[PDB]
Amino acid sequence: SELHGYQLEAVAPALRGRNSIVWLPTGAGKTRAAVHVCRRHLEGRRGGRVAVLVNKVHLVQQHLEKEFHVLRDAFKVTAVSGDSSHKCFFGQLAKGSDVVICTAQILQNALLSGEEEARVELTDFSLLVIDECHHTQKEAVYNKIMLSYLQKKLSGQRDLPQILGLTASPGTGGETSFEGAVEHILQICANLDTEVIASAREQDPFGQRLKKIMAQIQEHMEMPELPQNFGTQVYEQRIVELENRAAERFCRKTRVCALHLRRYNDALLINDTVRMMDAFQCLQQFYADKDPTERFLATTFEENRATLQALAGDQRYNPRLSKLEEILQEHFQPPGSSRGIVFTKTRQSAHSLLSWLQDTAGLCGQHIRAAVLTGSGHSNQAKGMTQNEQQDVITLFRYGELNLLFSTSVAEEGLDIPECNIVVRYGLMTNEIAMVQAQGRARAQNSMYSVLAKANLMERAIRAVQAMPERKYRLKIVELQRNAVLSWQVKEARSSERRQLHDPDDVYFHCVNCNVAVCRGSDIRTVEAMHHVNINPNFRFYYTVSSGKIHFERTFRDWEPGCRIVCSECRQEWGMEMIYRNVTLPILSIKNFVVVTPDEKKKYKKWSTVTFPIEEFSYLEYCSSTQ
RNA sequence: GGUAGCGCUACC
RNA sequence: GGUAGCGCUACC
Ligand SMILES: [Zn+2]
Numbered sequence: 001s002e003l004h005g006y007q008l009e010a011v012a013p014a015l016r017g018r019n020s021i022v023w024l025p026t027g028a029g030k031t032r033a034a035v036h037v038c039r040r041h042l043e044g045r046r047g048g049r050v051a052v053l054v055n056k057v058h059l060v061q062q063h064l065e066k067e068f069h070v071l072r073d074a075f076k077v078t079a080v081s082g083d084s085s086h087k088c089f090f091g092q093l094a095k096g097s098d099v100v101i102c103t104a105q106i107l108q109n110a111l112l113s114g115e116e117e118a119r120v121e122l123t124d125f126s127l128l129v130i131d132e133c134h135h136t137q138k139e140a141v142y143n144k145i146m147l148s149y150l151q152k153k154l155s156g157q158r159d160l161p162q163i164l165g166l167t168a169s170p171g172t173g174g175e176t177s178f179e180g181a182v183e184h185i186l187q188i189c190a191n192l193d194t195e196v197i198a199s200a201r202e203q204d205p206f207g208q209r210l211k212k213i214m215a216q217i218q219e220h221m222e223m224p225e226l227p228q229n230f231g232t233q234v235y236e237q238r239i240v241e242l243e244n245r246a247a248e249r250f251c252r253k254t255r256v257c258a259l260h261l262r263r264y265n266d267a268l269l270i271n272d273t274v275r276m277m278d279a280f281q282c283l284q285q286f287y288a289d290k291d292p293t294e295r296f297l298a299t300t301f302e303e304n305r306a307t308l309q310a311l312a313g314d315q316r317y318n319p320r321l322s323k324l325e326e327i328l329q330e331h332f333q334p335p336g337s338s339r340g341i342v343f344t345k346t347r348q349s350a351h352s353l354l355s356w357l358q359d360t361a362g363l364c365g366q367h368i369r370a371a372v373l374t375g376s377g378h379s380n381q382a383k384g385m386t387q388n389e390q391q392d393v394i395t396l397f398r399y400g401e402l403n404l405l406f407s408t409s410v411a412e413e414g415l416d417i418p419e420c421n422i423v424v425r426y427g428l429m430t431n432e433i434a435m436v437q438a439q440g441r442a443r444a445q446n447s448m449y450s451v452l453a454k455a456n457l458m459e460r461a462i463r464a465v466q467a468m469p470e471r472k473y474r475l476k477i478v479e480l481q482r483n484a485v486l487s488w489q490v491k492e493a494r495s496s497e498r499r500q501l502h503d504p505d506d507v508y509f510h511c512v513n514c515n516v517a518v519c520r521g522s523d524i525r526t527v528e529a530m531h532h533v534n535i536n537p538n539f540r541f542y543y544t545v546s547s548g549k550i551h552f553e554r555t556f557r558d559w560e561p562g563c564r565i566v567c568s569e570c571r572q573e574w575g576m577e578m579i580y581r582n583v584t585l586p587i588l589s590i591k592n593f594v595v596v597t598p599d600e601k602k603k604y605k606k607w608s609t610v611t612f613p614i615e616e617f618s619y620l621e622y623c624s625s626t627q
Numbered sequence: 628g629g630u631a632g633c634g635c636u637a638c639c
Numbered sequence: 640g641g642u643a644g645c646g647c648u649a650c651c
Contacts, residue, residue, distance in 0.1 A: 056648070082650065105631090105650045140632055141649070233637035237643045241639095244643090262644095269644095345635090346645060375647055378628070382645090409635090409646055430635065530630040530651060550628055556651060561628060576628055587629060607630075 006200040007033045013196035014164050015040055021133055021165035021192060023199040023462065027416075030166040031067045034129050037164060038068075041127050042075050042098055050099040051107055051161075052129040053142065057082050057387060059131065063101050071099060080106050086557040089117040095124065104130075104141045111145065122149055125161045133165030136191045137173070146191055151485050153193065165192050169433065172458055181461040189465070190480035197466050201319060206276040206311040207231065207268060213304055214264050220296060221257050231268030239265060247594055248601050250515045256293045260286075270348065273427055275321065276312035278352040283308075320427065320452060321356065327450060328363055331422060332403075335367035339397075340422030341405040341441055343412060347374045347382045349426070353406045370404035371396075373411055380591075386553055412438045419443070424450045501599075501611040508596045512603065513572035515594065518542045521610075524588070525617035527559070532607055532614070533578060533585040535622055543586055544568050550576060558619075583622065 007029055013020045014037045024030050034052070042048045052068070054060055060081040071077050075098035080090060082103065090110040094100045100107075110120035136142040146163075153160055173184045189197070201207075211230045218226050227238040243258035263286050271279035287301050311317065324342075331338045344350045350372045357363055357370060371393050375384045390410075396402045398417055405411075412434060421444035425435075439449055465473075507521035523536040543565040550561045562577025565586055575589040590604045597611055604610055 085651085103649065109650070135633075138633075144632095233644065236645095237638055240643055266644095348645095377647065379645090384647095413647095428635095434635080526630095528630090528651060532629085552628075554651085559651085564628080578629085589629065 001032070003032065003036060004029070007036075010198045010200065011037050013198050014162070017162060018195040019163040019193045021167060021170070021189070021194050021197050023167060023170065023197060026168040028200075030168075031063055031131070034131075034164065034166060035067050035070060038099060038127065038129065039071060039074070041162070042071075045126070048098065048127070049094075049125045050127045050129060051094075051125045052099065052101040052131065053104040053107065053145070054101065054131050055104060055135055055142070057103060060101050060103060063131075068099065068101060075099060077101070082106075083554055086555055089115070091117050091119045094120055104145060108141050108145050111148065122152065122161060123159055126159075127162045127164060129164045129166070130192065131166045132168075133192055134167045134170045134188065136165070137188060143191055146193070147484060147488055149193065150191075150481050151488070154481060154485055163192050163194065165194065170458065170462065171433075172461075176457070178457065178461065181457050182464055185461050185465050186476055187480055190477045190484065193481070194477075197462060199462070199466070201317060203317055204271075206279065206308060206314075206317060207271050209304065209308060209311065210264055210268055210271070210279070213300060214261055216300060217257055217261055217264075217297065221254065223254075231265060231272065235265050236262060236269075244603050247512055247603050250594070250601075253293050257297070260297050270352075273320075273345070273349050274352045275318055275356060276314075278348075280308050280312045282348075320454070323452060324424070324426070325360065325362055327424060327452075328357075328368065328404075329366070331448070332366045332368050336369070336400070336403045338422055339400075339403050339417070339420045339444070340424065341407055341411070341420065342424045342426055343428060343438055344406060344408055344426050345428060347372075347384065347408060350374055350406045350408050353426070357404075357406075368404050369402045370406065371402055373405055373407040375408065375410050388553055409434065411441070415441060417441065417443060421446065422448050422450075424452050426452050427454070495608065498609065498611060499613060502597050504612050504614070506598050507610075507612045509588075510594045510596055510601075511567050511570065511572055511574075512592050512594050514567065514570040516542075516567070516569060517596070518593075521595075521612045521614070524614050526607075526614050527578065527580065527585070527617045529616070531578060532588050532590070533617060534588060535585070535617070537626065539586060542568055543574055544571075545577075546571075546573075581619065583619075583626070585622075 006024070010022050010024055011033050014022070022030055022033060024033070038050050041050065052063065054063065060079050064077070064079050068077055076096070077099040078093060078097040080093060080100060080102040085106070090106060091113070094110065107120065110118060111122070113119050130136060130142060133142070136146055149160055170185055170188055172181045175181045175184050188194070214230050227235050229235055239258050239262045243255055243262070246255035246258060263283060267279040267282050270282055283301065284305070287298060290298065331340070342353065344353065354370060354372050357368070373385070373390060373393055376386050376390075377384050393402065394415070397405060398419070400419065420442045423438060423442050425438055442448065504522035504524070505520055508517055509519045509521070510517050519534050519536060519539055519542070523534045523539065524532050525535050527533055546564045546566045549563050552561060559578050559580040562579045562584060564576050565574045566572060567574060572592060574592050575587045578585040578587050590607050590610070594601055594603050595610065
């Protein structure tokens with residue numbers, strides 16, 4: 001498996017010592033080409049060091065076993081990830097090795113760390129290998145690393161590392177023009193300090209009924225200028241926008257009504273994508289888990305519950321599913337020869353369409369074993385899977401145990417399955433990058449491609465940049481570098497201005513649901529510049545410990561996640577605990593509180609935007625004061 | 628779970 | 640530029 005010609009030509013500018021972006025197609029072999037640059041770099045000098053910056057946890061160990069292990073004959077290589085983080089300090093481990101393969105935020109933490117053993121600098125490395133370098137933009141981690149690289153470069157710093165970008169698609173960044181597509185590429189060159197870009201229904205009475213129920217509730221609200229466009233992204237914005245204002249001002253009738261009206265609008269969007277029965281069970285389980293406001297809204301649903309369940313059972317009113325069933329009936333006979341993936345927008349659509357397959361008479365008979373594949377992220381509406389669960393299902397898919405998937409956009413890019421031969425993009429509305437990447441998952445000879453929906457530049461830009469004059473290129477890039485560093489200082493100063501407005505004691509925290517005051521801003525401390533905990537011992541009266549302890553797949557260095565916590569009076573979710581070494585501490589989520597200040601009452605979503613200074617937590621300080 | 632990031636759609 | 644929804648990701 002010796003290098004090809006195009007690989008050798010692509011790395012040529014990197015070997016001379018220049019900052020480059022190696023643009024090659026997906027799966028051409030950018031990682032093997034990087035290894036050759038790394039060996040040729042480390043062979044050429046002493047005190048040489050490499051940081052390989054991936055952007056996914058799986059890519060740390062993938063690069064090692066597939067590619068970078070070959071370098072171990074001459075040079076020490078070590079892998080650092082999220083899962084194996086808590087054992088050793090990075091500063092020691094990185095300085096002890098010749099090559100360090102890690103997710104970018106590990107290095108960024110090490111670059112900011114206060115502890116001398118965990119500390120690191122940019123000057124400590126002499127070749128950064130930023131894999132998928134096109135992400136180096138805006139306020140991403142990649143870009144914040146490289147933005148410090150530029151701030152130092154422009155202040156007369158020397159011996160900053162060689163930059164080596166790997167990427168398949170630099171992209172446009174939402175630019176359909178030719179003028180804009182070039183300017184986008186010139187910014188990414190300025191971010192990475194790059195010098196040479198190298199390359200080779202008719203009737204819907206279920207839906208119509210749900211709209212009428214929302215009209216009755218908006219009449220009960222008694223308000224003018226409400227939005228009259230039900231079952232839309234505009235309505236879901238406006239109803240939550242009103243719910244946010246109702247929470248800030250504390251208007252109980254408007255706040256409780258707005259939460260329910262969204263649940264009806266969610267059902268309208270669930271009804272549009274998948275079954276009528278899926279839209280019904282969203283509202284069913286909402287009211288089942290449960291003042292005059294909630295009593296009216298409970299009675300409003302109770303009358304329409306029996307009707308909507310009959311309308312959902314009606315087979316006259318989804319044509320999408322009848323179309324989907326005919327594709328599955330045809331292609332999966334013989335029983336389990338084919339191998340398909342069905343792309344959906346939401347996790348709720350993915351989890352619904354699996355249960356549809358199980359509750360259908362025509363498809364049961366053909367041996368189709370299937371499952372759902374989503375991400376590891378999370379929110380209050382929907383939960384996801386994990387990296388361990390995803391990899392089990394991908395294995396069972398690859399070796400023919402399971403032969404169908406209802407996946408989200410998790411696996412549209414990256415997932416290689418040689419035996420796959422079917423793709424069904426179910427009612428999506430994405431760009432042609434997401435379209436062409438989705439088509440490529442079927443790796444088989446005679447690959448099918450269906451686009452199940454309802455009835456009724458970059459390549460030129462890169463070559464234009466590659467063919468620029470050297471003087472014009474260097475004068476443009478130095479302008480864009482000076483721009484971003486000035487934009488950074490303005491944005492950090494502007495953030496510092498808003499942070500120093502009020503005092504900690506002047507700022508009070510209220511419960512988002514019931515508006516009872518609970519604590520002051522002086523009580524709060526940040527643990528690792530992230531977790532905001534109340535150190536006042538009298539705070540423990542206000543929160544109650546609801547459920548058992550939460551379990552993640554990972555372990556941390558200093559602390560571990562305790563039980564959840566809720567409001568003593570109204571049982572609203574506040575956050576969770578932190579069992580920091582030997583002391584419990586209450587973690588707070590800003591989403592579940594209305595922060596009162598001298599000026600205004602606001603419903604903050606981020607802790608970065610708060611208007612009072614918050615000090616760093618000290619374990620030595622808290623133990624001394626409490627004991 | 629907590630803190631961020633990005634992409635897509637939608638309105639302002 | 641602001642916000643919300645959804646999807647993906649990272650660190651802790
Ligand atoms: Zn409360």
